[PDB]
Amino acid sequence: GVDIRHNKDRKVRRKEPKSQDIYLRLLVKLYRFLARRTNSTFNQVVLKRLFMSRTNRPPLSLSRMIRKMKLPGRENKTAVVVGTITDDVRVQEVPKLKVCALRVTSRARSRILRAGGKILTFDQLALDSPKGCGTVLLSGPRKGREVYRHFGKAPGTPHSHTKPYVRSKGRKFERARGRRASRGYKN
Amino acid sequence: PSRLRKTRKLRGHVSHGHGRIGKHRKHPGGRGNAGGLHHHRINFDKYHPGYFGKVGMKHYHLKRNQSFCPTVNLDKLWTLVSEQTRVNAAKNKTGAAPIIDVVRSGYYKVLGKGKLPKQPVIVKAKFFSRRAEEKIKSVGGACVLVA
Amino acid sequence: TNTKGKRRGTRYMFSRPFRKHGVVPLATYMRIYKKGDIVDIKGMGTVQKGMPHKCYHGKTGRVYNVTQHAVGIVVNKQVKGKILAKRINVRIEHIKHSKSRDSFLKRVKENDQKKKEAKEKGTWVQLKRQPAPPREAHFVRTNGKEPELLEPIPYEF
Amino acid sequence: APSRNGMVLKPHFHKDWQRRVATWFNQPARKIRRRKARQAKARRIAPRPASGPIRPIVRCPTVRYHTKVRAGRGFSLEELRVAGIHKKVARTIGISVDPRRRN
RNA sequence: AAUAGGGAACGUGAGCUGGGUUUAGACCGUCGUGAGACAGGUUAGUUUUACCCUACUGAUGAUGUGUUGUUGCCAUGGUA
RNA sequence: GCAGAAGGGCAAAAGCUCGCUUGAUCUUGAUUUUCAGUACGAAUACAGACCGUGAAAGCGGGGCCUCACGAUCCUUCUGA
RNA sequence: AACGAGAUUCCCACUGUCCCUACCUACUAUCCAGCGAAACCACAGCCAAGGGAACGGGCUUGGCGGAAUCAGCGGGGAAAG
RNA sequence: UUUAAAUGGGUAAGAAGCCCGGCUCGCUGGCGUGGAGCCGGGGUGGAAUGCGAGUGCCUAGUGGGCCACUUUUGGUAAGCAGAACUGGCGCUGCGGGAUGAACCGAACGCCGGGUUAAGGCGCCCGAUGCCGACGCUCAUCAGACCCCAGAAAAGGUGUU
RNA sequence: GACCUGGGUAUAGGGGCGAAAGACUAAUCGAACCAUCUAGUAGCUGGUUCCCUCCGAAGUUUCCCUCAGGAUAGCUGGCG
RNA sequence: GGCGACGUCGGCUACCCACCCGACCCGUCUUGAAACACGGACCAAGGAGUCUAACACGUGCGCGAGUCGGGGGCUCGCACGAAAGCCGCCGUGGCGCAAUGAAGGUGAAGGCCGGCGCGCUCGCCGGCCGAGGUGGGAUCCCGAGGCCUCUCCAGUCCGCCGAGGGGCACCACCGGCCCGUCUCGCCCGCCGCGCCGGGGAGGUGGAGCACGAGCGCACGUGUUAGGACCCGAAAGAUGGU
């Protein structure tokens, strides 16, 4: 015997996607080639984001993308996102930025290609910049889901803010004791 | 898929995934929401605070058509018309503002939401908020009310 | 079973020690507690108005809040399998300044300035402290005399 | 019976519901039974129009729907009175009549 | 001569017996509004099976002696 | 001695006598104790009113401290 | 009083209840010819002591241990129901 | 209870730290006072040892426990009832304790060679079949190895 | 002889009938039998079907007409 | 390097037999079972975590501020076709895109610049814009200097680069906005001057906002309701013999 450990020796990350999409399976073969061979840390983040789930690749709208490319320095770079590009209705005009994503939606690649920008995939990204030089790899708001407002301490602990699972919103649905100091108590 | 599930993998093992001691029977805690104040109390607070009691006024026979008003706030307001309108609106002839009526788009009240663009409008809604109509009166627009 | 009362097991520890009873010394109140002052808690027994509990007596926290007659202190409490940053209002008689960082505050003051003495003089003073090393090969001297022969005494009751 | 953070639920299965069960297995069979009841009703009648008489312009009630226009029941004798056709002549002209309707 | 003291599932119910306690009937006393209660008294009340294995008791026999008979010897066990 | 069970505390006092008083009022949160780190109860430090006392600093939002109490549903009264 | 297949105590007569058992008969049992079940059954079936779920057939250390059976037997199998 | 340990409990052992310059405040108020906050600038090697951490969701089983050091409560005591700390058994085989849940070593993939731990080495039964050392002891009930499984007061001109 | 019996007849289930024992009512009676509601309920017993690999417990907290059971926290695994 | 022919050579299994060592009978509840605890004579076949609804989270797919025909409708009379295909002035509707209050109801954009009213603890006009600020922050950008067969002159490249910069998601913090209530307050408005509307500043309550992530389908785990993993009462009711 050697020690008394309560094993965590099997790390619990993803070494491949659980998808059987044969076009993502060739991006994996392309980028895990480029991960272990080009000696860059851009291509290791992009390789591990392709392994991620549909939840861990949240969508990215058009006005977080052009808002994080109005910044100083970003004037000629490419916005790489491992995940889909949607478009805000909120935004009015679009600049001529150059994007690179898995799966741009149809109205998003019409308003990008009206302004004169260019849409890319991860095949012609590697032919353009193998090291990933001059790239702003952007992410989506992964705690933007409806699921995270149900996550927290407990909905009936002090201050809590935790949104109980009620089946329907309204009066006479979880609003009486524990929620006002008259009827019982208040957390 | 009966193939892909836990009971094929758990066949051969005696208590079938439920324990020698606890020995899963039928209904050890009661059926349904039994004992919600008594022995399941700590579950019903800490996860459903508010579950017991009267809280308001009773309204017999409500009709979900009298209270019907959908809302659009001002960012979703220029998508009610074409994009061919607003590009035609601002190209320097006169103060010709387009209509945007939310009632033939299925909305009744116009709420406020920042970044209404620099063009003037005339917006025909049934109701307005005061934040909404003073964004409109600050882009040179007008606020006409309809029944 | 065990009477979960406030001020329960303090027959001795919420008492004035011995022959230090009576009314309190007044420099207890002329102490200056700012935010981030590290203070420790020793609840007295004469003032009843703000004694903390029997769980903080002998512990040490840090001032986050100052009011007219009391001080908010954020302490750590060992509850069963986790420790909890807890914040208690304690009146000013029950605390004092912790001198536990005051022997650190000298050797940041006379360490920063002795660092810049090696920049004007040119050396490698090695200002980090070391533990007690094993003893140096010294040299003892039995000059004149000869060592004393001692032997174990017999047993008598 | 309840557990961690979940939904408090009321399944209405406290009543003997397996006798009163309704399966829609005859539902393709009844879609081709009422197509054949439309086809053998179209060819049976005439060159008279299929799907019956002319319905009026009618506006819906109740604030939520009062901005739309719906097909109605008949033609509200006053409208038959102004147009000049008789109330008992009209339903063999192909015109639906609802006498209880108000203008 | 002496009427010492104890054990073996308080030895021993497919060995017996059933007097006692200890089902159902019943009487009396006390207690209870009552139904009923009482190591309180009394009376009447089904005691099943061995043909199995071992132990034991007897009854043949088995191994070896080439076969079989006769006359014996004593290891061991019991023991008055 | 401090109402009382104990322990802690207390001397131009927290005791004893006297003089005025109602802060034992109105209101929002935070915190501690029990603890799941939920509730009631008890408690602490404030903050905002309106007050009392004192020459004033101050002290006071019940009892020198540790105990002395109670959800939903329903009833009842009060409030704009 | 009379009456109890009622409960009890003593007495006379009477007797195998007993001292204390013995013998005889019939029917079985027993053996043979024919005919033939069931209960029960983890595997099985020699002990002592030890330890052990504190009372073993098996385990531990000892004693030891020859086929196959018959008539009985009621110690045990904490026997069966 | 004046005094008062050993073991123990908290905190601290730097960059979120230190110093300087200025400015906001309706707080505080003899005062360019006090205190908070904000901005900007200057100097990183600050006990020993070991180590990759941080974070969220979903979640089964469990909710009869038992034993031994040491510490202790009730009891005459108990293989008794009830706590504290740690380790075990339960969930765990193996070597030794003849035997065994918990003792002593030691924890386990399937083998070959080497070495050991606890424990042993007359013969069962591997190993003293050493020319082992020094004494003590005779029993007509000798003695013989943690837990552990048998004995006290008293007594002996028995021997040392 | 308040005698014994045949056949006919009447009484039917919370009812019958009883010189009374909770007796009898089709081998069933301190509430028959038959079919159904009904696969009635069970915090309680017994059972719960292939292999290998990897990780690996708990018998404690608080509340409950709670003490053979649950809810809760802890311990666990899987996904990241 | 060497040895051996028609009975020998090699080989092992669900073959048998022997020996030495080890080894109590399984399942089962239990702190503890070889138990003097219970079930099991033997063999064969049957035999126990299902399905529907709801919800939760994880994962896979399609579209994406939207998504979804499930209910209808259309298409010669076609086995397979109870399929598939299409509609879109069939999207009604569902869920999502907005919250809050018992309700009447109300309902989420700020900062700077330049000036002015007692620049009065308050504010006003116009422009510029536009989801604020702090501390961390993968990646990326810049980068003095550094690295090559003779020296001064020039080119691409690559590796090393102290330092500096813009900072993703996310965490902590500060500010802001919307609704309910509280306190303190002054001002403005007119399909009509009121027991009228609107505004302010501070504090608290909310399942909010702060450049959207949802919907549909499928699978897995979990919980529940149903006979609900299988078997099991003593009962209760209705109708009859």
Ligand SMILES: O=C(c1ccc(-n2nnc3cccnc32)cc1)N(c1ncccc1Cl)[C@@H]1CCCNC1
């Ligand atoms: O016949 C029997 C009889 C005897 C034993 C059983 N048993 N016992 N355990 C048994 C296990 C399985 C089967 N039967 C079993 C059954 C009945 N009688 C009897 N004896 C005593 C009490 C009760 C009765 Cl009824 C009659 C009564 C009249 C006089 N003659 C005897």
Ligand SMILES: [Mg+2]
């Ligand atoms: Mg269970």
Ligand SMILES: [Mg+2]
């Ligand atoms: Mg399970």
Ligand SMILES: [Mg+2]
């Ligand atoms: Mg030890």
Ligand SMILES: [Mg+2]
């Ligand atoms: Mg067993």
Ligand SMILES: [Mg+2]
């Ligand atoms: Mg009934």
